[PDB]
Amino acid sequence: GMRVLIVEDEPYLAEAIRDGLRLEAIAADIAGDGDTALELLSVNAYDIAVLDRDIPGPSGDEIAERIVASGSGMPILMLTAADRLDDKASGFGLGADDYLTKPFELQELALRLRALDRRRASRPPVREIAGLRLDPFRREVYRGGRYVALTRKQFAVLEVLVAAEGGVVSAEELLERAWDENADPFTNAVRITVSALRKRLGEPGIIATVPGVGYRIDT
Ligand code: BEF
Ligand SMILES: [Mg+2]
């Protein structure tokens, strides 16, 4: 079977999709808003995300962006009233794998879900090591079971270090992966963020400097 997430803020439509797919071995969870969608993604694995664009809270576009950035490789189908060519351009630009406009035919949605699921490949990024557990959908961190509040940028840097599994990551790579490609900050922004991150995580030290190279999670 298949498990899919339906993010759609018109409730009778979302329920009709879930209901219409169920006996064809596609089990769907429904989120009526962006915050609920992130809550579901933080705890459940899905085969496909079906995303409305205009929803309360964080938009379907922001959900898509977080899915792509999480490196799960979960395919994204946008299902939306935004039907202009400009809308398709921005949707595919955000990382959608398919784009279906309303009004739509349920059996076409089903055919496209099956086609997406067939061509999904793999290795999800490591998000847990050395007593740290990271959740990229809520941007939350627990260290030995204790919630640690971090800023967005602190979390982005910690994510890269944890994904590296104890391996070394240079300041230049942290720059590339945690600041936008069209940004060009200097390495001092990275070193300053690492210092703040260390202070948030507390003792004992868990991020090690490797002189002249970069930083690693101390395993
Ligand atoms: F509100 Be969805 F973009 F149709
Ligand atoms: Mg909507």
Give CA separation, 165 vs 9, 129, 136, 142, 204, in Å.
38, 7, 16, 17, 18
Within the chain, strands assigned E span: 2-7, 26-31, 48-51, 76-80, 98-101, 128-129, 132-135, 140-143, 146-148, 169-170, 207-210, 214-217
Just give the CATH number of 128-217.
Answer: 1.10.10.10
Pick the residue whose CA is nearest to atom 1 on ligand 1: 54
**Sequence ranges of the domains in the chain:** 2-119, 128-217
Instruction: Please report the atom of ligand 1 found closest to the CA of residue 54.
Output: 1
Q: Which residues line ligand 1 (CB under 6 A)?
A: 52-54, 80-82, 102
Distance CA 17, CA 208 (A): 49
Alpha helices in 23-105 (DSSP H): 34-43, 60-69, 85-93
Ligand 1: atom nearest CA of 80 is: 4
Q: Separation of 96 CA from ligand 1 center, angstroms?
A: 15
Q: Which residue has the tokens 């439509």?
A: 13
Asked if 5 and 49 count as a contact pair (C-beta separation under 8 A), the reply is: yes
Q: How far is CA 97 from CA 45, 79, 87, 216, in A?
A: 18, 11, 14, 34
Angstrom CA distances, 153 to 32, 88, 197, stand at 28, 30, 9
SS3 209: strand
Q: How far is the CA of 172 from the centre of ligand 1 (A)?
A: 39
Q: 52: CA distance to ligand 1 center in Å?
A: 5
Has 9 been labeled as part of a binding site?
yes
As its CATH architecture, domain 2-119 has 3-Layer(aba) Sandwich (3.40)
- Experimental resolution (Å): 2.0
Scanning the structure block, which residue is given the tokens 């391996």?
Answer: 167
How far apart (Å, rounded) are the C-alpha atoms in residues 57 and 82? Answer: 18
Q: Which residues, 6 or more positions from 103, have their beta carbon under 8 angstroms from its beta carbon?
A: none
128 vs 162: CA distance, rounded Å: 7
Is 60:99 a contact under the CB 8 Å cutoff? no
